[PDB]
Each structure stands twice: as C-alpha cells, then as structure tokens.
Design a protein around this nucleic acid. Structure first.
Lengths: 117, 63, 144, 200
RNA sequence: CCACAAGUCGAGCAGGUACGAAAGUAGGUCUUAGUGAUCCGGUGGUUCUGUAUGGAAGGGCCAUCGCUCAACGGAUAAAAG
RNA sequence: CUCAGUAGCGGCGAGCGAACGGGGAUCAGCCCAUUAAGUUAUGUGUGUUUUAGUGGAACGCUCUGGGAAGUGCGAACGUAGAGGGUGAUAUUCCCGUACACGAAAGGGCACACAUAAUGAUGACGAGUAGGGCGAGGCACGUGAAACCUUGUCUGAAUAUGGGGGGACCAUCCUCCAAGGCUAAAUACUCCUGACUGACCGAUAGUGAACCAGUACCGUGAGGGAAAGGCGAAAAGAACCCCUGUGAGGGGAGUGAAAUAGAUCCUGAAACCGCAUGCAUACAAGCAGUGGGAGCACCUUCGUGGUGUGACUGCGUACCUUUUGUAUAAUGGGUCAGCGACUUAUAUUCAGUAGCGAGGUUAACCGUAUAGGGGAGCCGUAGAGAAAUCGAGUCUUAAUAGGGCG
C-alpha cells in the first residue's frame, strides 16, 4: 500500500496561503514565510482581544472628564458623587450621553454635585 | 531467537516460592581476624533484595 | 444482522499502535519519547542487562554455590489428584506415562498428598508419602 | 428443536449444533482469521544493500561545502534503497479448535432464527442443465443460495457452475465466510445430520 | 544504619567450662582506625554425589590458607613514549 | 518437530551450546577372483505426454448522445456469466471460453526383452591397532579429558583373539577395524509452459517501460545517467494574406473538441507580464494586530457585500542547543516531488474471547483455512548444595529456637 502525499499536502498549503491573503511580498506567496506570518497574526489577535477593553474604557473616561470639567466638576469628584447618589449608569452610557446630549449630562452633574454637597 | 540465560547469574541464584535465594559474601578467605559472630552469621542463604529482583529476572528468564 | 459489514470486535479488544515522530499534537513528536542526547537516545542505545556502569555486578560480587544432580532430572513428582486421569485401576509408572502425567523419559515417580480421590486404586512400584498412603487406603486401595 | 422442511416434514435437531446463543466477538475473530488466511503475501523491496552500485564514497568528508554522504544509494537520495524493505510474509493465524466449532454453531443458530436456512428432504438434478437447476431453485424461492448436500453429484456441480450467486458444497466443506455471504443456505436432511454429528 | 553489596548493638535459651561461700560475672581488650568482593588453586573433616555396575578420579558442604589487587567496588595472568 | 537455551564449556568474562529418549518424512540391501544387487549405452515392443490446428450457443425496439456496450421496455443461451477488443460501462458484435475432435514427421518419460560394458586389482584386510612428542576436531579453551585425524619417532595380538561403554581397575553388556557398491525422503534456479498477488505504476518498479550497461567519465580494473501519453480514425490543416520562397502567425477547412496543431490528455506552485479599482513623493524599525475616516463597484438601498486603508494604541522572525538567545550562536535562496521507530523470533505485563482444575497441539498426513496427529509445553507443592523427605522441610545433640513454605 504505497501512499502519495500530493493532494493532501497541496490542500494544506493552499489553505495557509489563502489565510495569508493581503500581506506584503513573500509573506503572501511563499509557504514558509506565510506560515510564520499567520501564527503571529493569531497571537496578536489573542492579545488584542484583551487590550481592546482597556483602550475603550480609557476613551470613555476621557470623554466623561471633558464633560465634567465643562460642568464644573472633575472626573473623580463626579464619579464619587454619582456613587453617593446611588446612580449605577456605567461609563459607556455616560460617555455616549456626554457626546450626544449636553443637557442630560448637565442634569447628571447637577445630581452628582448635589449628592456631594 | 530464544532468550539466552546468563550462566553466571544462573550459577549464583536459585528460585524459591516467592523470590530468589543467594549465598553471602566475605566467607572465602581472611577468616582468622573475623569474630565468631560474623563467622556464624554469614553462613547460609538469604533473599535477593527487591531492588535487584528485576535485574535477576531479566538475566534468568527460565528459572 | 449477520452480514460481512455488520460484525464488530468487543470493546477494548483492539488498540491503535503508537506512531512516533508525527507532529506536535500527537504528544510523541520530535524526539519520540527518548529524551535529549546521551547513549540511550541513540539507535540501539540501551546497555547490556546486568551492566551497572562499571562497578562489580550483583552476579559477580556474590559466590557460586551448589552442584546439579543427574537423578533429579529423571525423578518425577505426581499429585494425588492426578490419579483420576488414570484409566483402569492399576497405578504404575507405565500407566502414568500412558495417562500423560509423567514424561516418557522419567525412570521413577513419587505421589504426594495434594488433592482428593474417590476411586479405589492399586499401586505397583511407585513411591508414596505417609499422607498419600493413608489417603489411598481410606479411599479403598492397596499398595503393591 | 423441531424444524419443518418445505413439505412440512418434521426434523429433530439438537440444541448444541443449532441452538447456541450468538457471540458476535467470537464470530468476528473467526471470520477475520479466515479472511486473513486467504492472503498470498508475495512481494519484496530493495534496501540500500540490494540496489545496484553504491559501493564508493561519492566525495571526500571535508572541504567541498556539501552535506556529507557515504553512498549514492542512501534512502535519502532519489533512486536509493527503501528504508525498511519488505519480504514475503505468512498471514495465517491460529484459531482454537473449540473457538472455531463454537463460531460455526453460533452462525448456524443465527441463520436458523433469521430464517435463511431452508431444510429439504432431497435435492437432486436429473440432467446437467442450468435451466433445470434454475427452475428447481426458483420453485423453492432460493435464487441466490448456497447448496449443501451429503455428496456432490457431478450433474448438480456442472449445472451450478455457471449460475451467479449459486454455489454447491459438500457437508464437510462449509466455511464461516461462505455461510454468511450468500442470501440463503439450502441444506439436505442427510447433510444436516452429518453437520449435527460434527456439531458444526 | 543503609541504593546494593556490606556494617553495628543485643536480652534470652541449650551444652561444656573458669573464678567465687553465695546472689552471680565471663561469646576478648573504655569505645570509635589496624583493611580487600568475586574468580582460580592449597590443607583438615564429611551418615552428599559418583556417566553400565562395585570402587576410584573429579565435584559439593563445613573449617581454614595464598592480594601495598594502596588508582584500596578490585577493566588482563601479562603493557612505555 | 521436541527434548532445551536444559547438561555442560568459558580472562567461569563477553559469549558458545549438546546428547539420550520420543513424534514424523522415506524406507533396501547386495558382494570380494566360477564374483551380486545396481547403473550406463544400443535396438525392439507397448503406454503416455509434447512440438501446428478444427468446430464451438444465444438481442431486438426506444431515449440521450460525435459515437451506446449507458436509460426505459421485453426476449434468448448457459458443461459457455474466464479474459481481451470494438468511438462511453457487452453472456447473446469480434477474438475467445465450457466441451468435443486432431498428427506426415520428430522429441521426452514409463515398463519389458536382446546385446554390450561396468560394478570388479578386489578373495576377511600389518608398518595396521596401540604408544612417546607437537598440533587439529569433537558444544568440550589441558582440563579429572575419554573418543576421532596425523607431521615426527616407534610398534602388537591375530578368535583360548580384539574394539567400546568420557581418567583408571575388576565384573558384566555390546560389536568385529585396518576391502567395496547402493534408490527415496534433502539443497538450488541461467532457463521453458500455465496461472496467481490487500506487490509498483514513469523521482515508483530492474541501473535500463524509450535503439541501456548506451551516452558520458577514467590509461586501466571500473563507475554510470536522463528520456512514456495528439486524435476513435491523420481526417496531420487544400487555398488566401504578412514575412527573407525563413521562423512565426491571421483567415479558410477537418474534427465531438484545435486554449486536442506536432516535446500536441489534464496543465498546480515558485517565477515573469498587460489591464482595472484604491492607496502612496515631511516621513523612521520582524511589516502584523485592535480601532478607523474617505473613495470605487455591487446592492434586497441597509445597522448590507466586495476591494483599498489616510490617521492611531500595542508589537525585536522560525528551528535547534542551552542557566539563559532579537541576538552579532546553528540551519534554511524559493517552489514542487521524495526523505527517518520497521520485520522475524523469544519473553513479561495489560485488555479482550474460548475452555476451565485443567488448557493447548508441533512437525506431518490431508484435492487441504476442515478433519486427523497427545510426542511435547504451561498450571496443579515446597524444603534442601545433594542423597532424601513432603504440608512440611533445612540447620542442630535438641521435639528448643530460627529460615524458607
């Protein structure tokens, strides 16, 4: 029972090269270089699925800081005031409201500073 | 091919019900300086240690 | 049912053989379970059985003892319960050889008290122990 | 048990030969042994010692910049010997006598309780004629069948030789693969008695 | 106590002793160093074996002898640049 | 085939390794001067086999199609439904197959007769058996070393005799050397015929599927390649045009197909062009990844699809070897194909199946995976160096104690 390797080997190499579409130079043409490139892309994706949450939380905090300083508070004081007032709206919704609705954010800041007082 | 016994080990060991018996060393010569207790307690057969039983089994497969 | 494509072995009867050096996922890739370097990792790498690295071996630091007896190779031992294989009532060396409890080249036999018997037997020329003789006589036989 | 022929006649068969429970693992082992014993096992390959030439070192050990080599017939090289060259083999296995007999008994009992065994008092052919045999099997509704008889008449053998899916064997030549492959087994009473005496 | 092979302490029991009136003490010396496995041979004893049989030769068992094998767990009977 | 990796041999190391007995295959004895069985030639007779060959059954319609053996519907032969071919897949188209016939002439084999010849310089075994010295062979290495052969020196008795039974002696048992012939069971394949394969299918299989032991290399012995495929059928492209009466192409024509057009089935990858869409000439690094504006095409008009990716956070390849590697430590120019834990025997453990105080055959026979074949092996009892005992045995004066059970 002699076995030839051509069909299966060709299928595996073609799948790797198909996943390597769009890369520069030999990285999308040459099997060795392409194979090294796909593994590194997977590792980067695994790491960045964790980095994404931190980056977006930082963005929300910056926007909330800008809105608070427009209303006369700092970010830390506004967060403490909301916690004391028992509002449990999270930073994503707070930043959305800060971006798109100034009056509602002003009301939230009034509530927070009233609780701080 | 059939396994071959190591004939030196065959001459040194014998099989018992649950193991192997052997003679004791230091009783061939230089006997005057040894005390009577060692002379009589190094006489007779003892058992092969469990650390060496596996090697004895490898060397003597038919006993 | 009962077709050449509907028969199966029992569970646990067959296992796949181990194949070394066929990738990471198999768990036995690369070195194939041999470790890294050294004599045992080479082809035909094990040392001779009984070799202990150079110190005097266990079978050479101990003394030889005893001699081999030639008559022991021709003396045969027969259990009492094996007398049931004997056809007839006479128990002798020839009859035991015919019943295949004694090898054909043995020249004498001894009967030991091991099991139980029911039939009555006559013994001619076979050695008996004190227990076996009592058992035979209790069953209802005679000696010589 | 009592068995009924195509004419309704009653035959007595012991439980030992035609009444055992089915042991699938035993049957599988025996059938696989028969199939393996059918192999021929004639082949060979050439190792690095058998390939023509290759005695001299192709080039010196050091200084040339090439990978070191000892012979042009190394299994690494194209045209070199095969790494592990095969030799003719024997593929027969040992089957215990009792295991073989038990497997045959189980097969016969399964055929009986699946209604694939047809008992007939007498099965003879008048002349060596394929059409006559075909009509005789069609009336019994056994077009695809293995025919077992106490003795193999030459006329019956010649008539059956050219029929597809029809084979005729003696009572003392039944094999487990043949008992299973055919759609039906048509057995004479005398053959059934001899197989009874042999206990499968 | 200890990888193994080895090493150390020991009440008590039987026989035959020595010294004490006796209860008793004694299986070397206050103790811890003064040493060498296996193989091969030598000497004394033996209700073991003994290649047809009776013996014998040879072998076994018990006691003991021949190592600066000191590179001292000792690659050979025998070896420098 | 067992006995048996046993008894033994061995710097008693590594290793080497019997015989007796038992089970089979095949079986057979005949002579030394008047001399046998047997063998080899020649001729004759009979029988078989072989070297050319002959006959040899049975199918139509319809649909798809370049072409039917393929679809659908019905039929026939079968001692022939093995195989090969025919424009795609045929028991009934062709060659064949089962079966039945066939030899002027020649060859082989078998048995039986006739003649030769051989056996057959040999008639009971003297420079022989045995011995001293040195070697060799026996499983057996000088060992307690029997037995066989002899280079050298010697040297009997001769049936009231002589050889052997593992140093040697006695007694018993057994055989008759120093003269010959003899089939079968056993070993092998340059070659011939038929058949077979859980053997290969052009980097495989012979080195060699092809004008291969060739081309080529070497003074020589010697070493030693690469290279298969148009189409069913050449029907292998008349004729016209560009060009140098070239190469190459464009029409026309053949063909089911010409991107099947001659190094012609299919035509992958590395590598190299042309075309369209987007990005790109103020910006520093393993070239991606998570976000993300704009543009182009498509569109179920969308919280849609495809291509591109301005700007931005993070981010120093892979393998090996190491205490430790982005390492300026090793290996890889790239692609495609090939390339490394196997096979036989023995043994131990674990699963699983059969039988179970029992289990199981080996060689071999067998028109043969069956059925026979029980020799042998493992288990069922230990203790002791052993003789010996035996649910006990060894040590001991001990029934004490203790060791193995």
């Amino acid at each position: 029972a002699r076995v030839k390797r051509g069909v299966v080997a060709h299928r595996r190499h073609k799948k790797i090269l198909a996943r390597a579409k769009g890369y520069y130079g030999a990285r999308s043409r040459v099997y060795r270089v392409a194979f090294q490139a796909v593994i590194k892309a997977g590792q980067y994706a695994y790491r960045d699925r964790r980095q994404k949450k931190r980056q977006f939380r930082a963005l929300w905090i910056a926007r909330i800081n800008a809105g608070a300083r427009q209303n006369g508070l700092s970010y830390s004081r506004m967060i403490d005031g909301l916690k004391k007032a028992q509002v449990i709206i999270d930073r994503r919704v707070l930043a959305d409201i800060a971006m798109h609705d100034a009056v509602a954010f002003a009301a939230l800041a009034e509530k927070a500073k009233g609780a701080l007082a | 091919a059939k396994l071959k016994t190591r004939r030196g080990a065959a001459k040194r060991f014998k099989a018992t019900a649950n193991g192997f018996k052997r003679k004791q060393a230091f009783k061939r010569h230089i006997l005057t300086k040894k005390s009577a207790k060692r002379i009589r307690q190094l006489r007779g057969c003892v058992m092969v240690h469990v650390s060496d039983v596996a090697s004895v089994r490898r060397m003597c497969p038919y006993i | 049912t009962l077709r050449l494509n509907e028969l199966a072995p029992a569970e646990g009867a067959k296992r796949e053989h181990r194949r070394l050096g066929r990738g990471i996922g198999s768990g036995v890739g690369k070195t194939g379970g041999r470790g890294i370097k050294g004599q045992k990792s080479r082809k035909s790498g094990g040392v001779r059985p009984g070799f202990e690295g150079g110190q005097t071996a266990i079978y050479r630091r101990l003394p030889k003892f005893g001699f081999t007896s030639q008559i022991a190779l021709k003396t045969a031992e027969v259990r009492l319960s094996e007398l049931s294989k004997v056809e007839g009532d006479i128990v002798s060396l020839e009859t035991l050889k015919a019943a295949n409890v004694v090898r054909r080249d043995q020249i004498r036999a001894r009967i030991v008290l091991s099991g139980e018997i029911t039939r009555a037997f006559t013994v001619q020329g076979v050695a008996l122990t004190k227990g076996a003789k009592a058992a035979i006589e209790a069953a209802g036989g005679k000696v010589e | 048990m009592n068995l009924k022929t195509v004419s309704g006649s009653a035959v007595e068969l012991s439980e030992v030969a035609f009444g055992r429970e089915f042991n699938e693992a035993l049957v599988h082992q025996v059938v696989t042994a028969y199939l393996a014993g059918g192999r021929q096992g004639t082949r060979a390959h050439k190792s690095r010692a058998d390939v023509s030439g290759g005695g001299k070192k192709p080039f010196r050990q050091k200084g040339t910049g090439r990978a070191r080599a000892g012979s042009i017939r190394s299994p690494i090289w194209v045209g070199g010997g095969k790494t592990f060259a095969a030799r003719p083999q024997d593929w027969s296995q040992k089957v215990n006598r009792k295991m073989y007999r038990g497997a045959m008994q189980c097969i016969l009992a399964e055929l009986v309780r699946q209604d694939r065994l047809v008992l007939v008092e007498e099965f003879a052919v008048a002349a060596p004629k394929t059409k006559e045999l075909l009509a005789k099997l069609n009336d019994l509704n056994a077009a695809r069948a293995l025919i077992v008889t106490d003795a193999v008449d030459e006329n019956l053998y010649l008539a059956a030789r050219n029929l597809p899916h029809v084979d005729v064997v003696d009572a003392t030549a039944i094999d487990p693969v043949s008992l299973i492959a055919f759609d039906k087994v048509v057995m004479s009473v005398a053959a059934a008695k001899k197989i009874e005496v042999e206990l499968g």
